[PDB]
Homo-oligomer: A and B are copies of this chain.
Amino acid sequence: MIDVAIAIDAESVEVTWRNRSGGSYDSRGNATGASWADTQIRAAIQPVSGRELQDLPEGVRSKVTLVAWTRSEVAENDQIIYLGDAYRVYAARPRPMDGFTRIALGKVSP
């Protein structure tokens, strides 16, 4: 009798998964990114080295990273909207023997 992902249910939160399908290129060489599909989903987010300040000459900006451990299937280039801001997926470590993955998220807004 197997249930490991039952641990991810103790702490979770509603983040909007945003699955992506690629586009193509205009005859002039430009790029067209399209085909987003949204779905509310549950994750277990933890702040592994989040919100590092950067006082560049151009001003001040932060560097935010996170980890996910979600039950659904998420690829390497998708989006997850959490706490009102979008995060792009660095890298996933899927475990198909069970149902869950592990994801690195970086904040998109500069």
| A contact residues vs B (CB 8 Å cutoff) | 11, 47, 49-53, 60, 62, 76-77, 89-95, 97
Contact = CB atoms under 8 A, between A and B. Distances in A.
**How many subunits of this chain does the assembly comprise?**
2
A50 B91 contact: yes
A31 B55 CA distance: 14
Given A62-B76, A76-B62, A77-B60, A97 B11 contact: yes
A73 B91 CA distance: 30
Contacts of A94: 47, 50-51
B11 A91 contact: no
A33 B11 CA distance: 39
Given A11-B97, A97-B11, A76 B91 contact: no
